[PDB]
Design a protein around this ligand. Structure first.
Ligand SMILES: Nc1nc2c(ncn2[C@@H]2O[C@H](COP(=O)(O)OP(=O)(O)CP(=O)(O)O)[C@@H](O)[C@H]2O)c(=O)[nH]1
Ligand SMILES: *C(=O)[C@@H](N)CCCC[NH3+]
Ligand SMILES: [Mg+2]
Lengths: 85, 205, 392, 61, 82
RNA sequence: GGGUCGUUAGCUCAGUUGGUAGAGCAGUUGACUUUUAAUCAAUUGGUCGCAGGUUCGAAUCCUGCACGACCCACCA
RNA sequence: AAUUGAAGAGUUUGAUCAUGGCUCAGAUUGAACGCUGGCGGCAGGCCUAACACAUGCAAGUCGAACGGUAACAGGAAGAAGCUUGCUUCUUUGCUGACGAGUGGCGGACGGGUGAGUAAUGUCUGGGAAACUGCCUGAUGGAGGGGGAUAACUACUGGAAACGGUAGCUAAUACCGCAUAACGUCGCAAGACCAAAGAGGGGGACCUUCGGGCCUCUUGCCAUCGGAUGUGCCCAGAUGGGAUUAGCUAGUAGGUGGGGUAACGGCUCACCUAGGCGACGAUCCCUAGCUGGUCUGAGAGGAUGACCAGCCACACUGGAACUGAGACACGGUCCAGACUCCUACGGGAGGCAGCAGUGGGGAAUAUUGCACAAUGGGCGCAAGCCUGAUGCAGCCAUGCCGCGUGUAUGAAGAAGGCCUUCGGGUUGUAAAGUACUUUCAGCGGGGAGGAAGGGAGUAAAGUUAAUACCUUUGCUCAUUGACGUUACCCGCAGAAGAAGCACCGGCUAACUCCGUGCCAGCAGCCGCGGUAAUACGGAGGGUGCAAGCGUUAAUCGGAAUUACUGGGCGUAAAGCGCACGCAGGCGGUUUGUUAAGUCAGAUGUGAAAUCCCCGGGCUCAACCUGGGAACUGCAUCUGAUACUGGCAA
């Protein structure tokens, strides 16, 4: 119904707005690397790796991404470029 | 609860009186006892095996006035105990409160000792008990509430009570209406004619 | 229901009655809207009062209704009465509530068939005051005719026994009164004065045991079953259990809540034309026309002896007398219960228009208070007017 | 198809009645019994000796 | 929030309090991790009417188990061994 | 509240210019009989739903109610 | 000390003994009905419509998170009357306090119902590839800035619901930079990852007179653990049906990518062609599951109402967000049905939460009260919310108690009744007479459920401080929904209170008249055709009791599904016979192994409930303490006769 505690809803509305934008840009950093791997530009991807790391790990510590989730991308993708490296 | 009826007819149906109508007239004699319970009392009591077990219940129950629903639980209460059933059954049938007053001498009849307890005349261990169901534990003392002490109903019954058998598993003082319930009864001293053998077997089915 | 009713000026249980098609319902609407200029809170039009869909397409009153109107001086409980002949049981129920009636007789029509029936049924129903109003005066223009119609009023009231000596006769046009002809509207206001002046307050027996004659049963969704009628005696608030004594075997339940035109009441006194909700009682578990007194005070009698004034055809009733085995309908304040009539050992049968007493049985039990003037009628016309001389 | 219990009844081929379980082993085809005195099926007159059965109320006296 | 509280057992007008060690999220009379001792506010005068094994209670409070108001007073009744 | 229609020996049913109510199965009484059926003989049975009015006269037309089964409103 | 426990009868025949059904004697209930009725105690109370539901209420709180005040209690600069402080009354968030807003934590719980589902569930014992706010132990840091928006203003959309454009503005809101490690990635090297500040009191220093600053309470952030809860996996146990024999496609598995907190066809891509199934896969039907419950000597059969654990659902089908946790009863969005509003564009909505209505049915409750106690949420706390919980109501629905009286009384009454009309019985029953007075009735005293919270004041720690804060004592003030309490006392008077079924045998207790295969009884056999012990009523007796009986359901008796614990020549029942796959079983000797087996130990077998032994309610029912058990399973270490595998 119409409860005073609906404030959590409009709050989550305001929350999901930026939460959308946070994870959206987050995965594009990851999408940057997949564009690189398909080609092979490892150094630039590595420049982007220590570039996407501080932004993704930052997402982990905030509360949007679970620490193991963000670490998972640091896990496989390191081996991915390492398949080339 | 109570039968509240002619408690002399119960001893004509049974034939063997169980101290029902004491009052003043000691022996009944005003009922043409043993064979006339109604219009067709001249009928022969063929009484099948079911009857001999049923009248045994009529014998015991009509003594203390305990109704079936209540009386039936006593049997379950008897069997759950250790060993001999009917023996543990009579142990319950003696501890009853209104029964003790009848035994202490304050009540000439059961209905007297029943309403005597009901009319606030008990003080056991310094506690008044209106309920007649109170099973009195051994080593318990009692007296009569001062305002109902040595009253008209008690005197007639108490002086008349010195002509009885006077049981052994208890003893009263009757000088200031002071009573003491001693140890629990034993089959040897009591009734000695009721065959509890039957009732236990009737409650076996 | 909404916003507790402020029990202001004393309400007087009234209601308009009269012949079929004499414009009674629209007059009431006209009364309400005009009083809505003395006491603003009112706007109940013709559609507001002839609410029933059955009545809607045809334009007739078949159900006993109620509207709330009042003058700044005194409050009023109104009853719109069914003006037809085959719906007079609704009218007796409609007039049972009254203490002051408003006789609507067309100044153009005179003493009509139902008018004579509504006056005859206004007589045995128990109405003590008959304020006569000449509706439809716009249609007639000659005043000489009016002198006769006024004398005709004197005729039917004094016909038997009424206060038809100083009857206040106002001349207004209900249609003109409702639509906007201020001149006829003020004439209704003359009647407003007569409704307050000619009628003094009815003494209420509130110190005696509670009593409530049942008019009709509703079932308003949300609260349960509502039962309406008038408070014959005493007062009650939520909580007091009551014995539903009626034509069936008695039932007991506690009264809860009392309203009046969606206006909430804490407690209801004697005379109050209100509604009553009960504690766990169905719509089926309650009928039209029972009694609601306090628990264990009334025996539903069927046997009794009662004096009665049977009516001759020339008097307005029976054409010929009746033997032992005559069974008309008996109206004890609310409904019908046919009782086969047997006259005592001295009579085989007695002529109409006379006074005689006899012992009669009832096919349906009811309170039966020995001394209450009860109503009787058969086949359309009023056949009797009696009083319960004794109860058994 | 039930059975009418008692001497005389006032049923009208309608008027909703109550039913209890019971076959009158005298008629090969009846398995139900009617509840006398209940809601529509009135009890028998002049009844005594166990008026619970027959649904008859104790006399007014 | 695992704590030590009461349970409110008993009957009509004759309550009783099974002191327990139950979770905060669960229903009072319901689930409990484990329990210890009991408390009778209407024993008032008899053989036993207040029992609590403080040793295991120490293992609880000495683990992060909070105490309810009356149960803290139950400890206050004994303090340690009084 | 209202608006229409239904009700006949005990049961199943008849019965319209308005003119003394019929048909079976029942069943009642006999006889033979232990009691019946059967068989031979005889045979009552509604006070035409309940009341009233009209008619000269009413199962029949008109009124009112009771009891149902079918229809719309019932809404402090 | 912890189950000291097992009854039969009627009924086939002219009669018998079997085989064998049918029915009853007992216990039980979430019961309904008929008739009848005093109260109190503890319990239960929609089994159908998981159909629709009008109205009130069912989850909020923090100023000690931030800008602010919409009102009130104050001071304050002040102003009006007018007895110049007697008061009026504009401004001031300066304060107590506090709408709305923002932010935090909560709403993922408590409470309801049993639609689903025969396995993802559940009970049970293990397991590893995980996560866990609130509480807490230990390691440290807690640096310093930025850029907006709500509030509120100005115009204003729209009937309303409900917003928009353009600006003001702080935060414990958000965003980087610094700093990162015992943390992540990673062979390593290397690289990266955080935050919040508020309040009390206050001495010097200090006063742009804001405060910095010092201390205490406390919170924020990163880390490892405990704790607690969640997700996952496997084995086993867990209805009926074969008149269902085949079922399966991302279905079985690998490799590689991706995915989630985590393993995984979890999901994809390519290859392989497997996987389940006669110890029953599928499909269909039914269904919440267990602890326990009713019964039963037990084994088992039925069952799971309340209560307690778990699972699922929250108008219908579906989806996703925020958040530690939901893919959410009182959240969002979508489509739909179903009700409502409307200015006809467009909007509102979910009682399977507590009460209450309609509806359905054999059938089940007040639109009562308090947050006094307990429990939870939030807060430093006081307090604030709570139809959880605690009470009262309504109902004989069930189990426990007492009551409707006690004693005398032959005249052996009246009347009813049988009559041998001799007399007997009803019947000490009644009146009478002599006593008592429970429970209501009514008038008075009156427990205890109450712990703590508050100020005051006192003492020790902490601290620069005899401040504050924290731990501990005493006083006063008090705080009870129930509640005209539980209970004690007193008044008057047997005064207000016994029905209900049966009475042929089964099975307790019999006669009279009326009806004559008619009217009816009935669980079973069978009663009634003119003397009914079975019908009707009368009398009396009988059995149970404020209920008694009827009806339905379950077990029993029923060894009439037999494992305990049955039979197959004629009673139901040997396939017509045979070969024979799996199936089940196996001579004799020894060695070995130790699965079955047995032994002992461990862990677990939740609690409650049954049982034993205590205690407290005037007793009891009931509540509660301890004890025993949970007959199980799994692991460990042993014995190895026998059964089995292996060898000879
Ligand atoms: N000329 C004229 N016509 C009028 C007047 N009043 C009413 N009419 C019409 O008379 C008609 C009857 O109205 P109504 O009010 O139902 O009458 P009633 O007398 O209640 C009828 P019922 O007998 O059914 O209860 C309506 O058409 C009304 O508009 C009047 O004063 N004058
Ligand atoms: C309801 O409260 C009544 N007073 C309305 C009028 C009578 C019933 N129609
Ligand atoms: Mg009209």
């Amino acid at each position: 119904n119409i409860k005073s505690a609906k404030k959590r809803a409009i709050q989550s509305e305001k929350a999901r707005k930026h939460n959308a934008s946070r994870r959206s840009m987050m995965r594009t950093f990851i999408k940057k690397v997949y564009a690189a791997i398909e080609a092979g530009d490892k150094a630039a991807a590595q420049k982007a790796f220590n570039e996407m790391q501080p932004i993704v790990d930052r997402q982990a510590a905030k509360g949007l991404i679970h620490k193991n989730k963000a670490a998972r991308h640091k896990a496989n993708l390191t081996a991915q470029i390492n398949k080339l490296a | 609860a109570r039968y509240l009826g002619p408690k002399l007819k119960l001893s004509r149906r049974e034939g063997t009186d169980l101290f029902l109508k004491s009052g003043v007239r000691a022996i009944d004699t005003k009922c043409k006892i043993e064979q006339a319970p109604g219009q067709h009392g001249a009928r022969k009591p063929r009484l099948s095996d079911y009857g001999v077990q049923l009248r045994e219940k009529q014998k015991v129950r009509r003594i203390y006035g305990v109704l079936e629903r209540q009386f039936r639980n006593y049997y379950k209460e008897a069997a759950r105990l250790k060993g001999n059933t009917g023996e543990n059954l009579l142990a319950l049938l003696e501890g009853r409160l209104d029964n003790v007053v009848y035994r202490m001498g304050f009540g000439a009849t059961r209905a007297e000792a029943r309403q005597l307890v009901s009319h606030k005349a008990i003080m056991v261990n310094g506690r008044v008990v209106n309920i007649a169901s109170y099973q009195v534990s051994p080593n318990d003392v009692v007296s009569i509430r001062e305002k109902a002490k040595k009253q008209s109903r008690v005197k007639a019954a108490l002086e008349l009570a010195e002509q009885r058998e006077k049981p052994t598993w208890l003893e009263v003082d009757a000088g200031k209406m002071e009573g003491t319930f001693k140890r629990k009864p034993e089959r040897s001293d009591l009734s000695a004619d009721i065959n509890e053998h039957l009732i236990v077997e009737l409650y076996s089915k | 229901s909404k916003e507790k009713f402020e029990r202001t000026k004393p309400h007087v249980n009234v209601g308009t009655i009269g012949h079929v098609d004499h414009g009674k319902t629209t007059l009431t609407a006209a009364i309400t809207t005009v009083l809505a200029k003395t006491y603003g809170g009112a706007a109940r039009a013709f559609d507001q009062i002839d609410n029933a869909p059955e009545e809607k397409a045809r334009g007739i009153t078949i159900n006993t209704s109620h509207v709330e109107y009042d003058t700044p001086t005194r409050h009023y409980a109104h009853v719109d009465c069914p003006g037809h002949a085959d719906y007079v049981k609704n009218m007796i129920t409609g007039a049972a509530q009254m203490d002051g009636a408003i006789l609507v007789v067309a100044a153009t029509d005179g003493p009509m068939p139902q008018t004579r029936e509504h006056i005859l049924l206004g007589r045995q129903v128990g109405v003590p005051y008959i304020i006569v109003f000449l509706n439809k005066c716009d249609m007639v223009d000659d005043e000489e005719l009016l002198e006769l119609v006024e004398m005709e009023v004197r005729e039917l009231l004094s016909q038997y026994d009424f206060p038809g000596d100083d009857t206040p006769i106002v001349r207004g046009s209900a249609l003109k009164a409702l639509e906007g002809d201020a001149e006829w509207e003020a004439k209704i206001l003359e009647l407003a004065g007569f409704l307050d002046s000619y009628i003094p307050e009815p003494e209420r027996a509130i110190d005696k045991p509670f009593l409530l004659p049942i008019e009709d049963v509703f079932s308003i969704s949300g609260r349960g079953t509502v039962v309406t009628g008038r408070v014959e005696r005493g007062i009650i608030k939520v909580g007091e259990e009551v014995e539903i004594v009626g034509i069936k075997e008695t039932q007991k339940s506690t009264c809860t809540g009392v309203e009046m035109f969606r206006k909430l009441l804490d407690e209801g006194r004697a005379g109050e034309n209100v509604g009553v909700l009960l504690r766990g009682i169905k719509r089926e578990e309650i009928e039209r026309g029972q009694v609601l007194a306090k628990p264990g005070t009334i025996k539903p009698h069927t046997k009794f002896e009662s004096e009665v004034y049977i009516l001759s055809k020339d008097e307005g009733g029976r054409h010929t007398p009746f033997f032992k085995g005559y069974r008309p309908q008996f109206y004890f304040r609310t409904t019908d219960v046919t009782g086969t009539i047997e006259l005592p050992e001295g009579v085989e049968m007695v002529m109409p228009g006379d006074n005689i007493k006899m012992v009669v049985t009832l096919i349906h039990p009811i309170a039966m208070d020995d001394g209450l003037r009860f109503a009787i009628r058969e086949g359309g016309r009023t056949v009797g007017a009696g009083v319960v001389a004794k109860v058994l | 198809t039930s059975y009418i219990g008692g001497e005389g009844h006032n049923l009208q081929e309608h008027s909703v009645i109550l039913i209890r379980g019971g076959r009158v082993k005298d008629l090969p085809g009846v398995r139900y019994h009617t509840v006398r005195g209940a809601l529509d099926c009135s009890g028998v007159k002049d009844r005594k000796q166990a008026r619970s059965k027959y649904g008859v109320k104790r006399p007014k006296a | 929030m695992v704590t030590i509280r009461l349970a409110r057992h008993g009957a009509k007008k004759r309550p009783f309090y099974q002191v327990v060690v139950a979770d905060s999220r669960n229903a009072r009379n319901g689930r409990f991790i484990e329990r210890v001792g009991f408390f009778n506010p209407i024993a008032s005068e008899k053989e036993e009417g207040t029992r609590l094994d403080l040793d295991r209670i120490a293992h609880w409070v000495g683990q992060g188990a909070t105490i309810s108001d009356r149960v803290a007073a139950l400890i206050k009744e004994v303090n340690k061994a009084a």
